Scaffold this active site. Sequence first.
Site, mmCIF file in Angstrom:
data_model
loop_
_atom_site.group_PDB
_atom_site.id
_atom_site.type_symbol
_atom_site.label_atom_id
_atom_site.label_comp_id
_atom_site.label_asym_id
_atom_site.label_seq_id
_atom_site.Cartn_x
_atom_site.Cartn_y
_atom_site.Cartn_z
ATOM 1 N N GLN A 53 7.003 7.598 -10.528
ATOM 2 C CA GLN A 53 6.265 8.683 -9.797
ATOM 3 C C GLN A 53 7.065 9.223 -8.597
ATOM 4 O O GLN A 53 6.685 10.312 -8.113
ATOM 5 C CB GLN A 53 4.916 8.179 -9.261
ATOM 6 N N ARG B 47 3.967 2.138 -10.957
ATOM 7 C CA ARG B 47 4.282 0.687 -11.055
ATOM 8 C C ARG B 47 4.376 0.272 -12.541
ATOM 9 O O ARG B 47 5.274 -0.515 -12.898
ATOM 10 C CB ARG B 47 3.240 -0.138 -10.292
ATOM 11 N N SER B 48 3.442 0.716 -13.371
ATOM 12 C CA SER B 48 3.379 0.416 -14.816
ATOM 13 C C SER B 48 4.707 0.835 -15.478
ATOM 14 O O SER B 48 5.266 0.073 -16.347
ATOM 15 C CB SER B 48 2.192 1.136 -15.442
ATOM 16 N N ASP C 40 0.859 -1.211 0.000
ATOM 17 C CA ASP C 40 0.000 0.000 0.000
ATOM 18 C C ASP C 40 0.892 1.259 0.000
ATOM 19 O O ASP C 40 0.537 2.187 -0.707
ATOM 20 C CB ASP C 40 -0.969 -0.005 1.195
ATOM 21 N N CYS D 278 -1.799 0.110 -13.597
ATOM 22 C CA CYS D 278 -1.856 0.163 -12.136
ATOM 23 C C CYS D 278 -3.053 1.067 -11.834
ATOM 24 O O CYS D 278 -4.081 0.901 -12.546
ATOM 25 C CB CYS D 278 -0.519 0.600 -11.554
#
Length: 284
Positions: A262, A221-222, A181, A215
Amino acid sequence: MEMEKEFEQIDKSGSWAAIYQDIRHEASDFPSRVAKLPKNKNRNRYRDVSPFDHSRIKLHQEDNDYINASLIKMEEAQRSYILTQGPLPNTVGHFWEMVWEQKSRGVVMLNRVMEKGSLKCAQYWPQKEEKEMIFEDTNLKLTLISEDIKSYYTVRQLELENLTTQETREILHFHYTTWPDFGVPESPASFLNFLFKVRESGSLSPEHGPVVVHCSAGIGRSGTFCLADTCLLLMDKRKDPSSVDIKKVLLEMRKFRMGLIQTADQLRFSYLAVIEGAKFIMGD
Ligand SMILES: FC(F)(F)[C@@H]1CCNCCN1
């Protein structure tokens, strides 16, 4: 400069934030006019994440051709990826239409439907064999065929039917279920295992359309997934793998979709995964 040495040098100096901001400063800026039209506001999960007009995927219909999805085309690596947001309640049918039209074999999902107590994407695939899904806006049917649940990732076999022509195809759903998370995984071992399972399937190969990767926003994440894949492929092709510059690969990829990677922790994790993966296949 060998990236492993560059890695230890940034870690000892603690400059991850400074490297990451230099990337953000040099990144391409192209127009996203189609994404910002008012008729498309409910087709976008986040106001600050849009596909560039030059690289966006177009839906094959005259009505409205818009989806929040980009084609990342790596020329020297000879790999293509589609990066998209987690589908919304009103874009589930658009999503499967894109999978059909682009001839994708695989869907890669790097998030859970609920994280941090909030919905990150729609329940866009069927959970039981005998309860199939029909998308009436795009005339498609989706059936769960089988499910293999492991500790770090689930693989599903799905059948997608074009109700207009009665053609069917098998789609593989690769679902990475254990990204935390908050932060990034401590070890890249299970992420690299997952990447090699997607590769083994044929989903990343040129006899199929591009893999669909998502994602929640389709950039973090992608971004990690396609940057690690492309960097390891380049290391297997080039006479000197140490020539492979991960910052330069990331800037090339950012010509095709904004914001890929990110945070400074996602950048560090991308280095870790490439360094460890290169060993996986380095007379090993
Ligand atoms: F940017 C470069 F480092 F030069 C390469 C070359 C081409 N392929 C995609 C990314 N990597």
